[PDB]
């Protein structure tokens, strides 16, 4: 009963001043150096192995730790420029990648790249996934979740995604990676515990995430108590607040996606 630890985190966050907030945001997080990829983007370099976004490094973190092992037909919901879609197209047992994203003004259009296995990637823009009828996949990825200063608004947004994701999961995919925008709210916990009982997996925090969000990833390769996993992350995020001296992020090399087509 009562307020959850994550709720205290969000309140404290919302109570920070401008200066404190931006220092906190990146404190002791993992960050990939995107310098080379940004210069590649503006040079139109499609063959250098540079990921289209920071999302590639996030998925890389999870896959290298076996939290998800993409296979067969991969469906990527909210693919954006295609960071997750392209990364999956480099996996050994992936046969097809299908991405869906809304695109349009203010939102990311899929980028056409020549990273390894690009020829098995098909991203369709102009697609609102909440109105897209589910399809069969072997791997389901979903990276949707728009932040709000309101934990109530984020709760509802998370619950809408989980309802949507549940429909795609009943379709059979045994591998999955689903962004949980607001995992600390009681209603979201209850749904997650229900979905874990049916579909398995567990919640993991990726350290590449900023301290200004509590996003966790529901992944098939994880297991264990959801509440404990969430509270631990709440503790780490709160412990990083009001620091004496800011250490900032730990920088890491970006993912290399290579080039070339793969056999079909
Ligand atoms: C700009 N913000 C954002 N913010 C809190 O941090 C949360 C995430 O905001 P953010 O850091 O802008 O991340 P996001 O919106 O995802 O931006 P991006 O898409 O660049 O990742 C908000 O929901 C809000 O609770 C803030 N809290 C305080 N105290 N002061 C601030 O200036 C801000
Ligand atoms: N209802 C919806 N239908 C389809 N796409 C949506 C959507 N709501 C948000 N999105 C999109 O989902 C994306 C989430 S960011 C996705 C990043 C991607 N994983 C990568 O690695 O590059 C945004 O581009 C946003 O435009």
From Swiss-Prot:
Domain mRNA cap 0-1 NS5-type MT: 1-263
Annotated positions binding S-adenosyl-L-methionine: 53, 83-84, 101-102, 128-129, 144, 217
Marked site: mRNA cap binding: 10, 13-14, 16, 21, 25, 147, 210, 212
Topological category with respect to the lipid bilayer: Peripheral membrane protein
Compartment list: Host endoplasmic reticulum membrane; Host nucleus
Active site: 58 (for 2'-o-mtase activity), 143 (for 2'-o-mtase activity), 179 (for 2'-o-mtase activity), 215 (for 2'-o-mtase activity)
In-chain residues carrying the UniProt-annotated modification Phosphoserine: 53
Post-translational changes noted in the entry: Phosphorylated on serines residues. This phosphorylation may trigger NS5 nuclear localization.
Essential for 2'-O-methyltransferase activity (site feature) positions: 58, 179, 215
Positions bearing the site annotation: Essential for 2'-O-methyltransferase and N-7 methyltransferase activity: 143
Function recorded in the entry: Replicates the viral (+) and (-) RNA genome, and performs the capping of genomes in the cytoplasm. Besides its role in RNA genome replication, also prevents the establishment of cellular antiviral state by blocking the interferon-alpha/beta (IFN-alpha/beta) signaling pathway. Inhibits host TYK2 and STAT2 phosphorylation, thereby preventing activation of JAK-STAT signaling pathway.
Record's subunit section: Homodimer. Interacts with host STAT2; this interaction inhibits the phosphorylation of the latter, and, when all viral proteins are present (polyprotein), targets STAT2 for degradation. Interacts with serine protease NS3.
The protein's name: RNA-directed RNA polymerase NS5
Naturally occurring in which organism (per UniProt): Murray valley encephalitis virus (strain MVE-1-51) (MVEV)
Whole-protein coverage range: 2533 to 2796 of 3434
């Amino acid at each position: 009963g009562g307020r959850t630890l994550g709720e205290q985190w969000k309140e404290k966050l919302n109570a920070m001043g401008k200066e404190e907030f931006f220092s906190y945001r990146k404190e002791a997080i993992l960050e990939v150096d995107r310098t080379e990829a940004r210069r590649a983007r503006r040079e139109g370099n499609k063959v250098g192995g540079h990921p289209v976004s920071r999302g590639t490094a996030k998925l890389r973190w999870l896959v290298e730790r076996r939290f998800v092992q993409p296979i067969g037909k991969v469906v990527d919901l909210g693919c954006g420029r295609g960071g997750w879609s392209y990364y999956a197209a480099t996996m050994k047992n992936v046969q097809e990648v299908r991405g869906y994203t809304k695109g349009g003004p203010g939102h990311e259009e899929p980028m056409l790249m020549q990273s390894y296995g690009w020829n098995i990637v098909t991203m369709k823009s102009g697609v609102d996934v909440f109105y897209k009828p589910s399809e069969i996949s072997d791997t389901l990825l979903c990276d949707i979740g728009e932040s709000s200063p309101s934990a109530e608004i984020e709760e509802q947004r998370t619950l809408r995604i989980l309802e949507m994701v549940s429909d795609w999961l009943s379709r059979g995919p045994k591998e999955f990676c689903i962004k949980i925008l607001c995992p600390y709210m009681p209603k979201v916990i209850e749904k997650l515990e229900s979905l874990q009982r049916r579909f398995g997996g567990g919640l993991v925090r990726v350290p590449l995430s900023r301290n200004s969000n509590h996003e966790m990833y529901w992944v098939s390769g994880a297991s264990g108590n959801i509440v404990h996993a969430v509270n631990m992350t709440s503790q780490v995020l709160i412990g990083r607040m009001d620091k004496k001296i800011w250490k900032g992020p730990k920088y890491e090399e970006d993912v290399n996606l290579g080039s070339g087509t793969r056999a079909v």
